[PDB]
Symmetry: D2
Subunit: 309 residues, 4 copies
Amino acid sequence: GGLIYGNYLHLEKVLNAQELQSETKGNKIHDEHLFIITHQAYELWFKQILWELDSVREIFQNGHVRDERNMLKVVSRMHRVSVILKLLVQQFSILETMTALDFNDFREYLSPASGFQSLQFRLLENKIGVLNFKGEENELLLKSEQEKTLLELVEAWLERTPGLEPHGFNFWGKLEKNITRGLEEEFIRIQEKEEQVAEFQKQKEVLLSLFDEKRHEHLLSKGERRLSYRALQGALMIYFYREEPRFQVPFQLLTSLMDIDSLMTKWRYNHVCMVHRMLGDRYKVFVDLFNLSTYLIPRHWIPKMNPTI
Amino acid sequence: LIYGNYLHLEKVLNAQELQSETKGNKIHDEHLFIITHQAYELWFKQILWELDSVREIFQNGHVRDERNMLKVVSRMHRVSVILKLLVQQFSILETMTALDFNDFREYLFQSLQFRLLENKIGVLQNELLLKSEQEKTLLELVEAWLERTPGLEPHGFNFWGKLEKNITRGLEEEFIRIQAKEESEEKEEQVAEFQKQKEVLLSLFDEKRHEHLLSKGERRLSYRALQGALMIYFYREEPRFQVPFQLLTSLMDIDSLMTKWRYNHVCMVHRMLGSSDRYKVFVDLFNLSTYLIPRHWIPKMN
Amino acid sequence: YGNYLHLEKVLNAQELQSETKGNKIHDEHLFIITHQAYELWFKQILWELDSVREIFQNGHVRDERNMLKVVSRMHRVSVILKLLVQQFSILETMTALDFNDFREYLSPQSLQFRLLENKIGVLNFKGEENELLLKSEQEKTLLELVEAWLERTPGLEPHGFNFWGKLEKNITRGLEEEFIRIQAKEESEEKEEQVAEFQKQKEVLLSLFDEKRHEHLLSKGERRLSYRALQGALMIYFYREEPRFQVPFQLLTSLMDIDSLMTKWRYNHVCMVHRMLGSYKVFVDLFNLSTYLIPRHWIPKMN
Amino acid sequence: IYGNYLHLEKVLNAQELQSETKGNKIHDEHLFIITHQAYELWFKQILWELDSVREIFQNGHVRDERNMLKVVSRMHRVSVILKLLVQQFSILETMTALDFNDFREYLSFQSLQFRLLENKIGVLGEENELLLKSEQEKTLLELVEAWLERTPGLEPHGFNFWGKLEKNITRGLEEEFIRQVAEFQKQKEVLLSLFDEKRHEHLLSKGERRLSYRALQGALMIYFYREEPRFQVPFQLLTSLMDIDSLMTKWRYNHVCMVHRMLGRYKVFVDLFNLSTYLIPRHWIPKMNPTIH
Ligand SMILES: C[C@](N)(Cc1c[nH]c2ccccc12)C(=O)O
Ligand SMILES: C[C@](N)(Cc1c[nH]c2ccccc12)C(=O)O
Ligand SMILES: C[C@](N)(Cc1c[nH]c2ccccc12)C(=O)O
Ligand SMILES: C[C@](N)(Cc1c[nH]c2ccccc12)C(=O)O
């Protein structure tokens, strides 16, 4: 029981929005209908993604994120985004059921300008923090480019991560100390040989490269990085101490952001592949989080947890 | 033209009205509910569009030009593909907590389009629905086409005759093979298998039984259609039957997908609101597949 | 690479009975590989499962630092089960008629799958195999291990939050307020319908507090968790936003997913058998708990 | 029977976590073993299906045309298996890079079977012997090329499809010339490039294309006249080969992506994709003589 299905879902608009340009020009093509529905579906789902995303963005801005009671809702909604993105990557299968030769039979009645022109997808990219002729649309796109990105909102939250406090756990200090010492112990172990020595020097460069705030700041300006040095510390804190209750769900959030990044990538790849199939990365907003995962500090070196709290 | 205008996004993306918000207390998860079901409908529309197109290719009689069989299989396959995506789409709503659902259940369901689909395929069973119940179902249109299958001609290949002959003879040969099992333990077990198999195998030739079961609802194709089907199944390697076989396989897939969709839709209702069925339009085709005639018994084509 | 993965065994495990008997199904190979794959994945599921079971038995579960590992590994099980449900697609690429062409060389069953069912807590083979199956029937099921953990859920303490007391109080009061709302507008068709819903809901809502009913149904098999466990669950369900309950909630959701996937797997496995040869949730309580539709306003406040 | 039939005695006793063997048993390694053990099982099936199609070409049975259904069926099956494999990446995405590092100590890893597959399809000691056979024996691309060259209607003394095509395209372009101006000249260049055997031969040598000029004609014949019974299933075969190409690509992409995730565009059937791109208007497609097949 409920209000009339069609009326509630406003199917009067949804199911009366299908206008085959083939039919309008006289020469009706069967496969065009699929093209309309497919892209109409993508948009419906984009709308939901933006809806979920914008909601999490507020939970950061409105500062509710500070109440760690809200972290479950955050992870849930972000996860949902990845799930939707997966379905969208699968949905490419539907259009793969259309022959290039059949496509050409209606390509003639398609404008080249808006070949992408998914305002919603641009909005999504902007909103997440990735890297057009419109009016009121261009106004919305403006809001997108102007307002605070998820990357931005998460950066702040990451910077406020507990344990970074120097007069507290001094995590970064302890890390720099223990890594420097352990490398030295390795150097003493070294003192095949030439190959081993190379590994050491290479590892050393990488391992010590964090703690070169200057390098980070440069690369941040150069675009190679996007998070603050402090944020990087927040992240690693969460990564290393994820088993710690107050970090368990936060870790999940980070993992989810990385999934969303890769799915987004996959979607673009499939979208490109399809365009070449029909008519013959700097996009990783959370690059830093992937990189943080790569940093191969041995377990023995990870600063041990005091009675803490 | 231009993306939004071409896709008429002005309607599709302005169709989301959370009854929660309208009544004052907006809930976040309702939006998902609207979009999810709005998506199902979009896809139903495409399925009906593809289906109706195949139905015509039968009615208009173009199906007689076997040049059209590729288009038919292609479009029918597409239906199954779309149905698969729909069965996967259930994952999206599984991302909604029953407890969150209850928070909007108080505010705010059968898809006319889905009923139309069921009718159009031939599920036993403003009023567009009427046209659906009245017009020729795919089952009906396929039945006719199956009845006109080549080789069924009695004064020709007399496939059915040859089959009844070869099966009867082979069973007898098996009976002789069994008869000298020296009253063993295995023998009695073997004899049971034989009798069971015999009953099933020879059941196929009891037009009366079929006609009864047809009336009872247990079967849905004509006796002649059953013969058309088996002809295609046994001789599918034969060029003129290769694609036709694909069509039959596809109809069976669509049946099972349709079933899966209903199962998930029921499962979800019990999951949210907290408390094969004669729904296999192509039952006969599944059954035909089961018939375990040895290959050497299948009437030879020469 | 081959040595590390011991492919020397994994490959050279494929013997088409058709070929051995002199014929050749040329599709039997798929049958072997498909089922060989299912088994590989079952092994991993049992491996992950047994690991979670220990984290309960060894009592490490008490350290809520370990809850992440638990949810992670349990989630992984569901992911693997999904892949297994998708893997049915591979065998759907085999014609019944082609199957029959090698079914002749086959006999009428995964120990591993039985082991899984037992281990999770679902209600013949060689000796040593039967020994493993014995361990399965004997050892403590995940359902059992989670029951205990659920019973120790915080807030159930009567001298503490007295959650159940507060709940019975608040539900009784709210229903009464609804009863007062009833006869608020002149007895109508809509009113009569609403009044029915109320009576129905009341019966259900108040049934929750009938320990006797539970105990009976527990004996009858209709339920599987302890009354106390049911309380632990609801505590977690209602107060899942609460930090110490966030991940625990996830664990419960995961157990329910695993149940439904397991169901789906059996359905597809049955469907396939009928397709080829012709012609109950361990965590029922958790699903049921989800159904109980208490309004938010009624949930005992956490202050 | 059961375990014995599936020889699970080998399959389920092939699990040695190097971590455990060296003393430091790591839980996630088991998944690594099973995951890759599964990939290999499926590769074996893909090779099995592939080799089978390859023979049906070599043994010349493909000529019968009754065998085309089996061919498409088995090739389709390959794509299905490849899809499952692309989905299987999800399982390993359930492993944290941080957990991986905790057993990366036991690292050395490329699948002989996958290389064998690539060779067999036609990607440009005793193990090395098998790999040799792979590089030596006739690739599917090769076997399909031959079959494509024998496509009906390419016969110049027959339908002279290519001739008719060149004629009809040239005429229609002229009509357009009599009738954006840049677009025309550009399109013309591309459209007429198809008839430059020299260009093809060069690009074939350069590697940019892989099918024979004649094969290209066979393909287009099938593409344009796919509605024709006797081309219907052949068209399916071509579509399937293209799918297999893209799936293979996807698998490599995910495999690379995973390696970068954990440790920190040339298709065998390029020609077939390209053929699809060449967008001849319907009105131009040479009409089928009363001698249709
Ligand atoms: C009170 C707090 N939620 C603390 C906080 C910030 N970032 C975190 C990351 C992981 C764990 C905790 C935090 C806040 O400052 O918002
Ligand atoms: C000319 C025809 N299409 C012949 C026909 C009918 N049913 C078939 C099944 C399989 C193969 C061919 C047929 C017709 O009579 O429609
Ligand atoms: C310390 C504890 N892990 C407490 C506990 C038990 N069940 C729970 C459910 C949700 C949250 C916490 C618990 C234990 O008693 O083992
Ligand atoms: C008899 C044949 N199968 C002819 C042939 C070759 N390629 C084709 C493509 C489509 C249709 C037919 C063909 C043969 O040469 O084996």
